[PDB]
Each structure stands twice: as structure tokens, then as C-alpha cells.
Design a protein around this ligand. Structure first.
Ligand SMILES: *[C@@H]1O[C@H](CO)[C@@H](O[C@@H]2O[C@H](CO)[C@@H](O[C@@H]3O[C@H](CO)[C@@H](O)[C@H](O)[C@@H]3O)[C@H](O)[C@H]2NC(C)=O)[C@H](O)[C@H]1NC(C)=O
Ligand code: NAG
Ligand code: MG
Ligand code: MG
Ligand code: MG
Ligand code: MG
Ligand code: MG
Ligand code: MG
Ligand code: MG
Ligand code: MG
Length: 496
């Protein structure tokens, strides 16, 4: 294992500096029964530092106790990852090959944080430098002129293969479109207010559904298979006049009927029938309404595997009214967080190198999502430049890895480590279990059990105050620990 090379840029914490010959690295340590592992990251600069401690048979005192309830079972976890946008691919490929491989290993290798999801845009988005679709030849309803351009064949696809080949965990791919070809749209433009022409069940909608199959066919020719697709990225965006970049507007009723008549049946009657379909792929305030509109129509519901949710400017929001209510109404339709990013005010710089606050936003969001039944959490761009780009409409945002081309260097932000406290230690098939606090407290925490029956607990302290605490597992005993102010911990232990 190789330690963080820390660097401050004046924010509250440090980045870890990587280059062609060096990057910080680690696989999770399950010590002997009766011992626990602790991984600690701190604002002061500790980065996922491993320590161990004893598990006692007994505990006495008045301090905070967190008690696992391993017989209280909740959702199974699909996983964690990020988005291979054109911008992410361009930034990674701007490094020398050895630096590229250390960046990819940081995310995708067991030496890194064990990502197992990659979100793949279907053609261009704001994090593109060229506006294109896969079928720009006008009025090509047959999709004879459907093809993948070099953004896919020379940048994204080869990087996806490289990422998958570094992983031991199976990696799941998720596809989402931003716009259709403009000749399928009411406004004839990639951006602005515009929807598919006509109505679900017609030639425009059947062509758009077929475009999904042609996309999956084309990636399958490149030996890539998808776990899932979403029905549209941010369908509410295309309802807005002046929307600045690629979009395709659907009301929830339009999405319902498109799924029922066109996309569901077209996918089901294809070689890609095992690919899951996720609805919504948009902000939380649209729930539970969107779920009610789509999932109460049995001819739409039969095709919808899950509900994809985005996080933006609401990482510290309460989720009971949106995620909680949606789970209560539709508990057998999984919730999955398909996109999250930190945005700045329109006049502010998008990237804050070394912001601990942005790290805490990521981990607080992941904990909140897990406590409201969400099965996975997906970051946005895997890497950006120090401006938060490139981006053809200057809609810059932050990313967990920032590439500086001019020094063949990349910077791992606090967000990287906050996500890794979950991704590295919560394999696919892990299950959230109960965790109860003895007294009111300022901590954020979640407990899960691995498929093999091991325990994992994440404890985030967004306060400035150190909090001594005890964790009880009724089968092994008590972990006496401390949660320092501005820390995040992941605890691991064997239960037998
Ligand atoms: C990439 O990052 C690594 C880690 O921060 C940098 O590693 C450093 O590499 C230099 C190589 O010149 C090492 O310097 C050595 O200094 C001694 C003492 O003067 C000298 O006798 C040696 O010949 C050599 O120059 C340095 O110790 C090493 N540090 C670590 C922690 O491994 C590397 O420089 C970075 N690459 C670039 C291009 O900045
Ligand atoms: C579209 O595909 C057809 C059939 O292969 C081909 O004849 C035509 O040249 C293509 N059109 C364009 C504009 O590429
Ligand atoms: Mg600290
Ligand atoms: Mg308790
Ligand atoms: Mg897959
Ligand atoms: Mg408009
Ligand atoms: Mg495919
Ligand atoms: Mg409007
Ligand atoms: Mg978005
Ligand atoms: Mg981003």
C-alpha cells in the first residue's frame, strides 16, 4: 500500500497527488474473529488509514451506543460507480499511459475503491465538446445510418474495456440518452424545449425505441453488455423553454405511455430483453408523483425494473417525502441513484481542490440514500479538468478526480475517498441491516452485511466535535471507538 501525497490549494483539506510513477493505493482486511478493522479519513489529511482493535464481550457507560440489528434486513446493494462521459474520457486520455492506468486502477482495481458501475451516455451531453447523436441523417426512420462515432469507438469503449479488465468485481454498465436525433423532435434542435413528435405508439416513438436496440447492438459488437438503461436522462429538463443543452422532454404520462407502447415491448422483443429498464432518471422532487403516474399503469409497470434518481443541490436534503414515500408505495420497484454531482453558484468556480465539505456532501448523500432503500449510488463525470470541463455550454461541476494535463498529474479529491468508504467495502449483494442509536447524536451511520455474513458500518461525523462511541454486534460484542470531528470511518468485522 502507498500513502496519499497530500497537497492543499487553500480549501479545508488536501487532495492526493498522483502522476505517471506514483499513486496512493491499498483489498479489505477481515482480521481474526474478535478483532475489527477501521479505515479512517479526516479533514486533517488521513486517507482511508487502516487500524485494528479488539471486540469486547462487555460494555459499561453512558456514551453513545450504536446497536446492529442483523435480523432486521432491508435492501440489497447493486453497487457504486461513475460516468464515462466524453469529457471524462478526454481528461483520462490526456494523461500519459502509466498515469491513465493509475487513475483507472484508483477507481476500478481492488488496489483502489472497487467501482462496479459505469454510466455511459448514449451520444452527446453537456460533458461533450461536439453535439451529435447516433442517427443525424435526416428522416432515417429505418435507422440505416445509425452508427457509433469515434467518441464511442476510439474514446469511451476502449476505456470501458480497460476499466473492466482491471476489476475483479463484475462491472455493470448503465446507459442513458440525453437527446434523440433532432428530426424526431418537435423543436428540431438538440436543446431547448422539445419532445418526440407525435404520441407514444407512433412512427417517431417506435423509431426512438429501436434506437435503444441499435445502441445495444452496436456496443454488443464491441463486446460490451448493459445491465440497465434509463428511459431518458432528466426528462423534465426538455419541458423547459431555453433548456441549454441536450434534452428530450417527457411528462410522466408521456414517459408512462412511451414505456408501455414502445420502449418496453421493443426491448422485450430483442436479444437485449435481459437489460433492465429504469424510469425517471431525474431529481427527487418528482417523486412520488412520477412513480405513481408510471407504475399504477400495469402495461407500463410490467417493463419497469427500477426508479433512477439524481442528486444536485440537495445532498443534505431529507428524503422521507420523496424516496421514503416512493418505497412505501412501490417497495418492489428498486430505487437507484444514477447521477450525483456538486454544483457551484453561476458566478463561482466549479472545482474546489481539497474541499472536505464536498466530500461530506457525497458521504451524507450515500448514507441518506441507503437509509431510504436506495440500492446503489452513481457519481457523474469520472474525471474533469481544473475548470470542471470540458463542457460545450460551460455547465462546469466538480469531480472526484481532477486531471492537470500540463503536469501529467491527477488529484484525488476528498469526494473520491468519501465515496470509497462505501464502494470499496460494500460489495454487490450486501444488505442493509438495522442500526439503532441509544441517544440523540450528530453522526450519520449505516450498517450492512456482506453476502458472506461479515459486517460493515460507515460512520460520518460532519460536526466539529469528537464523539466517543460504542458499536454493539449482539453475536461478537462491543467495539469501543471514537468518531473525530470532520471524519469518516468504515468498520469491518467477521461475525464468526
Ligand atoms: C510523481 O510523484 C512522486 C511521489 O510524490 C514523485 O516522487 C519523487 O521522485 C523523485 C525523483 O527525482 C525523488 O527524488 C529523489 O530525490 C533524491 C534526494 O535529492 C535524489 O538523490 C534522487 O535522485 C531523486 O531525485 C523523490 O524522493 C520521490 N518521492 C517519493 C515520495 O517517492 C515524483 O517526483 C513525481 N513526478 C514528478 C515528475 O513530479
Ligand atoms: C445511409 O445509409 C444508406 C443505406 O446503407 C446509404 O445508401 C446512404 O449513403 C447513407 N446516407 C448517409 C447520409 O450516410
Ligand atoms: Mg480532521
Ligand atoms: Mg443502541
Ligand atoms: Mg453490464
Ligand atoms: Mg426552448
Ligand atoms: Mg450492449
Ligand atoms: Mg418552460
Ligand atoms: Mg444532471
Ligand atoms: Mg462531475
Amino acid at each position: 500500500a502507498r500513502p496519499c501525497i497530500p497537497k492543499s490549494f487553500g480549501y479545508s483539506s488536501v487532495v492526493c497527488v498522483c502522476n505517471a510513477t506514483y499513486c496512493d493505493s491499498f483489498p479489505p482486511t477481515f482480521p481474526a474473529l474478535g478483532t475489527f478493522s477501521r479505515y479512517e479519513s479526516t479533514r486533517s489529511g488521513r486517507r482511508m488509514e487502516l487500524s485494528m482493535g479488539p471486540i469486547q464481550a462487555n460494555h459499561t457507560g453512558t456514551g453513545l451506543l450504536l446497536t446492529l440489528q442483523p435480523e432486521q434486513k432491508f435492501q440489497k446493494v447493486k453497487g457504486f460507480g461513475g460516468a464515462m462521459t466524453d469529457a471524462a474520457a478526454l481528461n483520462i486520455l490526456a494523461l500519459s499511459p502509466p498515469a491513465q492506468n493509475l487513475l483507472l486502477k484508483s477507481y476500478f482495481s481492488e488496489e483502489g475503491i472497487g467501482y462496479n458501475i459505469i454510466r455511459v451516455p448514449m451520444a452527446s451531453c453537456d460533458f461533450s465538446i461536439r453535439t451529435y447523436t447516433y442517427a443525424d441523417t435526416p428522416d432515417d426512420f429505418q435507422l440505416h445510418n445509425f452508427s457509433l462515432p469515434e467518441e464511442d469507438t476510439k474514446l469511451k469503449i476502449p476505456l470501458i474495456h480497460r476499466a473492466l479488465q482491471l476489476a475483479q468485481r463484475p462491472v455493470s454498465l448503465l446507459a442513458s440518452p440525453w437527446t434523440s436525433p433532432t428530426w424526431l423532435k418537435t423543436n428540431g434542435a438538440v436543446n431547448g424545449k422539445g419532445s418526440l413528435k407525435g404520441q407514444p405508439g407512433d412512427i417517431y416513438h417506435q423509431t426512438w425505441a429501436r434506437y435503444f436496440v441499435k445502441f445495444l447492438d452496436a456496443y454488443a459488437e464491441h463486446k460490451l453488455q448493459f445491465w440497465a438503461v434509463t428511459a431518458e436522462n432528466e426528462p423534465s429538463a426538455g419541458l423547459l423553454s431555453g433548456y441549454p443543452f441536450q434534452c428530450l422532454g417527457f411528462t410522466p404520462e408521456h414517459q408512462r405511455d412511451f414505456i408501455a407502447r414502445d420502449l418496453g415491448p421493443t426491448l422485450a422483443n430483442s436479444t437485449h430483453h435481459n437489460v433492465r429498464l429504469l424510469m425517471l432518471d431525474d431529481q427527487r422532487l418528482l417523486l412520488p408523483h412520477w412513480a405513481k403516474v408510471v407504475l399504477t399503469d400495469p402495461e407500463a409497470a410490467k417493463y419497469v425494473h427500477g426508479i433512477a434518481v439524481h442528486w444536485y443541490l440537495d445532498f443534505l436534503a431529507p428524503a422521507k417525502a420523496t424516496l421514503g414515500e416512493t418505497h412505501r408505495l412501490f417497495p418492489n420497484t428498486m430505487l437507484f441513484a444514477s447521477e450525483a454531482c456538486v454544483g457551484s453558484k453561476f458566478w463561482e468556480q466549479s472545482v474546489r481542490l481539497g474541499s472536505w465539505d464536498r466530500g461530506m456532501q457525497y458521504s451524507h448523500s450515500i448514507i441518506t440514500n441507503l437509509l431510504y432503500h436506495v440500492v446503489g449510488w452513481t457519481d457523474w463525470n469520472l474525471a474533469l479538468n481544473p475548470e470542471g470541463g470540458p463542457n460545450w455550454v460551460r455547465n462546469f461541476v466538480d469531480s472526484p478526480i481532477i486531471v492537470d494535463i500540463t503536469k501529467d498529474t491527477f488529484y484525488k479529491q476528498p469526494m473520491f475517498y468519501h465515496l470509497g468508504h462505501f464502494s470499496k467495502f460494500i460489495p454487490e449483494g450486501s444488505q442493509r441491516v438495522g442500526l439503532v442509536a441509544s441517544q440523540k447524536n450528530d453522526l450519520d451511520a449505516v450498517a450492512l452485511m456482506h453476502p458472506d455474513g461479515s459486517a460493515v458500518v460507515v460512520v460520518l461525523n460532519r460536526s466539529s466535535k469528537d464523539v466517543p462511541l460504542t458499536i454493539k454486534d449482539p453475536a461478537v460484542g462491543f467495539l469501543e471507538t471514537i468518531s473525530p470531528g470532520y471524519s469518516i470511518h468504515t468498520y469491518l468485522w467477521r461475525r464468526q
